Homo-oligomer: A and B are copies of this chain.
Amino acid sequence: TDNTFVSGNCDVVIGIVNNTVYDPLQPELDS
């Protein structure tokens, strides 16, 4: 999450793909 930011949505950019973004906070918040 420190490399990319949230801007817009996924219905405007032509030629977009899907990908699973890894989050290191989720193993740290559970433990």
Contact = CB atoms under 8 A, between A and B. Distances in A.
A21 interface: no
Contacts of A31: 29
A1 B31 CA distance: 17
Nearest to A23: B28
A3 to B, nearest CB: 8
Nearest to A28: B25
9 contacts: A1-B2, A2-B2, A2-B5, A3-B5, A25-B25, A25-B28, A28-B29, A29-B29, A29-B31
Given A1-B2, A28-B29, A29-B31, 4 more contacts: A2-B2, A3-B5, A25-B28, A29-B29
